[PDB]
Symmetry: D2
Subunit: 268 residues, 4 copies
């Protein structure tokens, strides 16, 4: 049967059909999973997109910055999957950093209010989500988050790299808490993916240099990667999240699995 056959999985972070979460949800559904989806702000738009998934799935509003949304989350999920049922998987595919903190603006010019908003959404919310959903998770369960290797500095990513460094630390502590429930907590450090936003930067939305920068990053990534890297294909990343959601990585927690073509293991 499917790799996630009979598993109830919550998938957050679908905004467009280019979203890494859209591919995670598609592959999970193809693999037998029953999903609950969470969306933020543009809920009629998210619903129009989630309608294109292989199967029907409840859509729940979740702004990770809203305390009431988090407090009611477990209650709202239980109502959607049915009383007496628990989640076997949670996918955090949420990330945000204002333009002041990521892009063409100098590193020193990012106001802390902006950096703090980005760290809240990109790092702290991994713990928020785990706090809310662990009480309605089954033993053997899995929490997966999305990472972009922050171990070395790079142009443009700036405070998003700082936020991913914090996310990596948050994951290690979430694992400590999750373990009390028999639940694993891990990250998928993916190589660059051509989402709508990335296609817009490459296209010059923020100028020729920011575009050239992303194309240069992508070129070197495919070059270093012993098996190559196709930024236009999120399926290898989606498959890796599903591997972690499955029972096939049962002794891995507080960790990072690199779905990057093996680029991080090569210098040149």
């Amino acid at each position: 049967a499917g790799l996630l056959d009979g598993k109830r999985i919550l998938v957050s972070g679908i905004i467009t059909d280019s979203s890494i979460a859209f591919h995670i949800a598609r592959v999970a559904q193809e693999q037998g999973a029953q999903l609950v989806l969470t969306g933020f702000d543009r809920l009629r738009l998210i619903q129009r997109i989630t309608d294109r998934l292989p199967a029907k799935a409840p859509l729940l509003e979740l702004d990770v910055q809203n305390e009431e949304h988090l407090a009611s989350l477990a209650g709202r999920v239980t109502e959607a999957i049915g009383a007496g049922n628990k989640l076997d998987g949670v996918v955090h595919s949420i990330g945000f950093m204002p333009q002041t903190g990521m892009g063409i603006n100098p590193f020193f010019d990012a106001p802390y209010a902006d950096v703090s908003k980005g760290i809240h959404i990109s790092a702290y919310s991994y713990a928020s989500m785990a706090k809310a959903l662990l009480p309605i998770m089954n033993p053997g369960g899995s929490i997966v988050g999305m990472d972009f290797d922050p171990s070395r500095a790079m142009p443009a990513y700036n405070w998003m790299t700082v936020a991913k460094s914090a996310l990596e630390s948050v994951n290690r502590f979430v694992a400590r808490e999750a373990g009390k429930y028999g639940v694993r907590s891990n990250l998928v450090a993916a190589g660059p993916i051509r989402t709508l936003a990335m296609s817009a930067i490459v296209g010059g939305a923020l100028g020729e240099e920011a575009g050239a920068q992303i194309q240069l990053l992508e070129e070197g990534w495919d070059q270093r990667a012993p098996i190559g890297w196709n930024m236009k294909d999120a399926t290898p990343v989606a498959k890796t999240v599903c591997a972690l959601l499955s029972d096939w990585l049962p002794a891995t927690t507080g960790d990072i699995i690199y779905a990057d073509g093996g680029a991080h293991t090569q210098l040149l």
Copy 2:
């Protein structure tokens, strides 16, 4: 419709039914894989152990230190799986370090001839095996090897830790070579497993202190592991090797997946 259905996989390193390779072979077979097994010396003695696996599998002699064994290996594998057939997976579960380099003997007292024998078997042979089998491997294939996290020094493991540090480097270069074939190369860094040598030291073979050191390591490993660690259970390790042998980790190469209960991510 198991995880490795229709896959032809070579599994090296079975000596007892406690061997990590025995559990890898058992889980792979349970998951629909057609296996070729390689054994070191015994063969007749090894065959009686492989006979206890869920299904029949050809047993081939392979001493990684013997040049003729490696030269003839691909030819012998092809004969066993049938002309026109190729391997989809290779499992290197081979390791050895003489008592002089691993145990109660001081680190400075290990003669280089002994360290060299251990490095040959435990590290260099990962490249030797890849060299021999990559020409008879299919695109999308996977080479998996066994590691014991050498990133920090520890008592007793001494030169076996040094050998694993070399193994980790070898795997990153093997990935470069394997990529030319569409093949991934990765290591499963396992927590301590009660195999032949481990059960011997615990049992008192190198005295009361040495046995006590291993029991203390194991206690602390389970303590650190947010999901715990059972050194008497190789199934979580075997399942992880199968995840890497599958098509569910398609963008991971030259890497290390930690099947250690998440112990390496926790300080205390």
Copy 3:
């Protein structure tokens, strides 16, 4: 004759004579450096403590959360060292995490407002300080910050570990900026030291079950440390900051130097 002879160095973070910055200031002064000191809140207590240093040094108010304090900082430093003079070194020995995010309070119960305050002071302010002081720094100069190894999760440190993970990332980006000035940026990852909040008999934000855990950390640190760890001696840490402030580590930037007795390199 001294290691920092003729060097003008700014030292932040003195509150008591137990403060790592007090020892950095003392060793730097012993080594020929001319200092400018920055203090926060209790500027009367700070002045009396700084009066105990081997030599006189101007004391300037600096709350890293106050925008005006940062905007006026370079101007105020220049006034103290004399027009036409620039800093050769900058020491960031600033850290803070509320009791909700560091201690016995559950990890999930730390409100983001508290975590954000801690990340602002402990991580973001390293960039804030570099932004303010780099325009008044000389080529060959050095920015040093204080880190506590966050690569593995641990009890009690909780969100302070998350903040140090962010600090490490901030340092790599600050190095990029500093390099444009011929200035190096590095962190000193110290072993635990009994400073104001760490205090067990007189003062301290550490009490009851948390105090028990920090005692287990202490003993563990010294056991792991091949050269031992004295939590009551900040001199080895102070000497390491001075090594980075000197011209003896001229090719090291965006890095971490561990003054921890070597504990981080040992498993057991």
Copy 4:
């Protein structure tokens, strides 16, 4: 006075006036150290080179592969520095990998006899040297070895990268032993240095493709390094070894100090 004033230091690995050890020996002597030098094979030539150092220093024969040379080493050093005197420092600047294991030959084609020779000289000998000299070292002493970051694979370096991975592991264990003597053990991970052999490759000794590979590595290194990288200047590397030989890094052992311009901390 000098950074190594009154310190008795053994310096190995001088073969040409371009050798990293020649610069280490020159800077150490400039900084007040009294040295003992060890040379291999071409001792009349080594003497001619070492005659160009700022001060006279005894030259001792030491082939790290010769057991008698190691057994007699401490005795021979004591005779040179005078009875009752001990070394305060030891510099291991020894490295070798045959052309089959480093260069233009395929990674899989390196015979183990060649790899074993290279690992013996480049990694194992760090432990051999420490075994021999620790009994004649003073508390507070320092053992320093030379490294080239092997954490990521790269073209051409092949089995030398594998040997450096082993060296890094050896260092962590040597630290455990050294600590019993109050002696620190660390490695200096240097960026590429234009030694005679490097100038020969760049110049086309192993063909145009190999030259271009080295030139490309060096170009990328200077690019990533926030403070740049001059492969033609060994002084920043020599100064870093001296910082470790001094009393200014007293809490650092079993570690790696990167004298690489900060390159290893930057992706691009």
